[PDB]
Design a protein around this ligand. Structure first.
Ligand SMILES: CC(=O)N[C@H]1[C@@H](O[C@H]2[C@@H](O)[C@@H](CO)O[C@@H](O[C@H]3[C@@H](O)[C@@H](CO)O[C@H](O[C@@H]4[C@H](O)[C@@H](O)[C@H](O)O[C@@H]4CO)[C@@H]3O)[C@@H]2NC(C)=O)O[C@H](CO)[C@H](O)[C@@H]1O
Ligand SMILES: CC(=O)N[C@H]1[C@@H](O[C@H]2[C@@H](O)[C@@H](CO)O[C@@H](O[C@H]3[C@@H](O)[C@@H](CO)O[C@H](O[C@@H]4[C@H](O)[C@@H](O)[C@H](O)O[C@@H]4CO)[C@@H]3O)[C@@H]2NC(C)=O)O[C@H](CO)[C@H](O)[C@@H]1O
Ligand SMILES: CC(=O)N[C@H]1[C@@H](O[C@H]2[C@@H](O)[C@@H](CO)O[C@@H](O[C@H]3[C@@H](O)[C@@H](CO)O[C@H](O[C@@H]4[C@H](O)[C@@H](O)[C@H](O)O[C@@H]4CO)[C@@H]3O)[C@@H]2NC(C)=O)O[C@H](CO)[C@H](O)[C@@H]1O
Ligand SMILES: CC(=O)N[C@H]1[C@@H](O[C@H]2[C@@H](O)[C@@H](CO)O[C@@H](O[C@H]3[C@@H](O)[C@@H](CO)O[C@H](O[C@@H]4[C@H](O)[C@@H](O)[C@H](O)O[C@@H]4CO)[C@@H]3O)[C@@H]2NC(C)=O)O[C@H](CO)[C@H](O)[C@@H]1O
Ligand SMILES: CC(=O)N[C@H]1[C@@H](O[C@H]2[C@@H](O)[C@@H](CO)O[C@@H](O[C@H]3[C@@H](O)[C@@H](CO)O[C@H](O[C@@H]4[C@H](O)[C@@H](O)[C@H](O)O[C@@H]4CO)[C@@H]3O)[C@@H]2NC(C)=O)O[C@H](CO)[C@H](O)[C@@H]1O
Ligand SMILES: *[C@@H]1O[C@H](CO)[C@@H](O[C@@H]2O[C@H](CO)[C@@H](O)[C@H](O)[C@H]2NC(C)=O)[C@H](O)[C@H]1NC(C)=O
Ligand SMILES: *[C@@H]1O[C@H](CO)[C@@H](O[C@@H]2O[C@H](CO)[C@@H](O)[C@H](O)[C@H]2NC(C)=O)[C@H](O)[C@H]1NC(C)=O
Ligand SMILES: *[C@@H]1O[C@H](CO)[C@@H](O[C@@H]2O[C@H](CO)[C@@H](O)[C@H](O)[C@H]2NC(C)=O)[C@H](O)[C@H]1NC(C)=O
Ligand SMILES: *[C@@H]1O[C@H](CO)[C@@H](O[C@@H]2O[C@H](CO)[C@@H](O)[C@H](O)[C@H]2NC(C)=O)[C@H](O)[C@H]1NC(C)=O
Ligand SMILES: *[C@@H]1O[C@H](CO)[C@@H](O[C@@H]2O[C@H](CO)[C@@H](O)[C@H](O)[C@H]2NC(C)=O)[C@H](O)[C@H]1NC(C)=O
Ligand SMILES: *[C@@H]1O[C@H](CO)[C@@H](O[C@@H]2O[C@H](CO)[C@@H](O)[C@H](O)[C@H]2NC(C)=O)[C@H](O)[C@H]1NC(C)=O
Ligand SMILES: OC[C@H]1O[C@H](O)[C@H](O)[C@@H](O)[C@H]1O
Lengths: 94, 94, 94, 94, 94, 94
């Protein structure tokens, strides 16, 4: 019969830059071995966050350039915001 | 034989309000196509968060009124808090 | 034919503490019913969060001792940070 | 994603009659259990056969009144044929 | 996770020729909608048979030119044989 | 979700003895690579049959010694029957 099933892969990228500050941005090459049949959907979020109250909390995360073979794990803060340590989590299913 | 397998859907919903503050609360109808054969589960979180340090960080997000047809992507803040931008993420499996 | 498919179990854990500050750390055992063929993968994030601006934001979370029958839903803050309410969300797939 | 996967059920049914000839036709209700989700196809054939050369070889078999919960395994012969033994084999997938 | 599942298709082709005798051979086009990811395996047999004892029983059948799109349901006899009526059954799975 | 899926395997062994008559019995060992998770169901039938009319048609076939790793492809005739050529077909799903 015809049915719906999803293949999923997931992981966590961790960043501990303290005492140093974590970079404005960061991009990681995440690959799916083996590739998917079609380009899956991916969502990213935070599992651990270390933000200084001396400035507004501005943390953005995302999956950019999603290829059936992998995707770019993207993170960035902006303006005067300062991030000390942070863990990203992502899950891509199809 | 019998096996376990899930069908998962997933999406994001970006709310950029700056220079205006984001609505205190938000509810968006999300539709599943095609409908699940049985009610699915749904977890919601944040992929991007921009909140003013002028006050405590009070952000809530959920999936209310879930069914086989879909759910309501609910988000809200409370008290004297202020959010300039935020991205909600969700995933629903069965 | 040989294919890839998954089984995803997921959920949420709400911790309301205000007016009492939430515990520095909190562990919660989760059970997979029935058990997975093999050891799944879990990722935990936040779905709600209430953090005091009087200090930096320091929230961490993870899935510990993940077995075919369950994992431990871990939460913790550190140092001077304070938390009033929060919701954890996790999802596992094989 | 969408995939095509089938569930199959299959069985044999031996009929030994000799020294007596097997009855002109024979019907036997088969039960799928648990029931099927869709109404499946079924094909019947012969795994063993013992027929008399004294006449032509006239044998017929078929799945009948197929539900999502079973069907009638049917066998028969017409006219002057004489069958001494036979085993029906059947397979039903979806 | 990696599992083995199969997709199967099946069907029958009834040939009632009496009083006329059945053609020596028959090749029928069977197609698959939609086609397989990869080329299936196919097997054929007889569901009903009507062979004249005046001569030896000789029946052959097979799936020819099998591809992801379908195949050719071939049937034939040879030499002195005579077949009055007959049905073929086939099932393909990948 | 819980669903039903079968994994199948199939094949056909041919035997061309004319003018030599085919042995009374034959047993071919079949392997299942990779080995089913749990013991499968097998069914065998005739894809090509060539029998001399000078005696009753007595043919039999089956799958014996069925294990998750394989099975034995059994075939025989008995008493006065004489078989010149024949082909067996088998399909085993779990
Ligand atoms: C480009 C960027 O990343 N901007 C993000 C940032 O917005 C802030 C900036 O645009 C700065 C530019 O100087 O302006 C902030 O608004 C300020 C100014 O208009 C200021 C000028 O006097 O007045 C207000 O702030 C004053 C004072 O400057 C502060 O030191 C004092 O503590 O508070 C005063 C009263 O507020 C005004 O707020 C922008 N800030 C806000 C809020 O819009 O951050 C926002 C939100 O985090 C967005 O992310 C921008 O993209
Ligand atoms: C209804 C709601 O959304 N409440 C959420 C909020 O709780 C705060 C409110 O209940 C306000 C009501 O006035 O009280 C806060 O507690 C205060 C007061 O007890 C106050 C009295 O002096 O003392 C503390 O704060 C003072 C002063 O008020 C502040 O302006 C000053 O900057 O700092 C002082 C020292 O702290 C005390 O905090 C409630 N706040 C807390 C914390 O309990 O926010 C909480 C957490 O974010 C919950 O979300 C409530 O539901
Ligand atoms: C163990 C732990 O959980 N540490 C986490 C914490 O780090 C802070 C602590 O290590 C404290 C220990 O006293 O030091 C902080 O750095 C401070 C101090 O050196 C301080 C002494 O005067 O000077 C700086 O801070 C001043 C002032 O004290 C503040 O009130 C003012 O607002 O800012 C000033 C300039 O920053 C210095 O920053 C550590 N803080 C930081 C930042 O590193 O928190 C961090 C980040 O949240 C990590 O999580 C640590 O593990
Ligand atoms: C109703 C049914 O099941 N019929 C199936 C059967 O058909 C045979 C019957 O229709 C009988 C009815 O009497 O006729 C057979 O044809 C015969 C006659 O035309 C006959 C007249 O002389 O000539 C042939 O046979 C003779 C003689 O009758 C035999 O006893 C003798 O051994 O041989 C002679 C020479 O053949 C002729 O065959 C029908 N037979 C055939 C063949 O059509 O069987 C057929 C095929 O098995 C179908 O299944 C019918 O439905
Ligand atoms: C052990 C075995 O494999 N037997 C299978 C076989 O059965 C036949 C045998 O048991 C023989 C043993 O001698 O008997 C057959 O029955 C015959 C005899 O009773 C015979 C004695 O006169 O009478 C009948 O046969 C005559 C004549 O001999 C034949 O030449 C003529 O064509 O027909 C006449 C009338 O039948 C009688 O049939 C057994 N045959 C039958 C039929 O029972 O074959 C059967 C069916 O194929 C089973 O497979 C047995 O297991
Ligand atoms: C979060 O990261 C994404 C990835 O860079 C940012 O996406 C860009 O968004 C702007 C407008 O919002 C577009 O003009 C760009 O085309 C996007 N980049 C691409 C090609 O993906 C997003 O802006 C970031 N959010 C914040 C607040 O920094
Ligand atoms: C987060 O959002 C959810 C949904 O809006 C809130 O849940 C509601 O809780 C109240 C408790 O008094 C119920 O009356 C509502 O019916 C609930 N909504 C439903 C059915 O989803 C939750 O309280 C919010 N949390 C915070 C901190 O604001
Ligand atoms: C977040 O919580 C996890 C779980 O308690 C912490 O993980 C431990 O990390 C240390 C090294 O820092 C390892 O030696 C332990 O094996 C880990 N524990 C377990 C049971 O996984 C993690 O360190 C915490 N991070 C923060 C920011 O506090
Ligand atoms: C073989 O068996 C099938 C199943 O009993 C027979 O099917 C009947 O076919 C006739 C016409 O072909 C229909 O009018 C009947 O309604 C069918 N029966 C039902 C209820 O399915 C078929 O006739 C048999 N063929 C032979 C040669 O005996
Ligand atoms: C049964 O039918 C098959 C298919 O027509 C026959 O196999 C063909 O045999 C010829 C030579 O004898 C080859 O050139 C073809 O390539 C074969 N077809 C394929 C692709 O399988 C087979 O000979 C027939 N058997 C009998 C006894 O008639
Ligand atoms: C058809 O083949 C089967 C399999 O060989 C035969 O059944 C076996 O018969 C022998 C002798 O009675 C037993 O020792 C085995 O246990 C049987 N196997 C099983 C479990 O089926 C069957 O008798 C054959 N039929 C004919 C007509 O020869
Ligand atoms: O049955 C005996 C024998 O009759 C002829 O020789 C055919 O060519 C063979 O295929 C076989 O059918």
């Amino acid at each position: 019969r015809l049915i719906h099933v999803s293949r999923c892969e997931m992981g966590t990228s961790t960043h501990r830059c303290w005492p140093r500050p974590c970079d404005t941005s960061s991009d990681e090459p995440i690959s799916f071995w083996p590739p998917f049949e079609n380009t899956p959907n991916v969502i990213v979020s935070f599992g651990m966050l270390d933000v200084d109250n001396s400035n507004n909390l501005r943390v953005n995360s995302s999956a950019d350039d999603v290829t059936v073979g992998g995707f770019t794990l993207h993170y960035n803060s902006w303006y005067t915001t300062t991030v000390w340590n942070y863990k990203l989590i992502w899950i891509a299913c199809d």
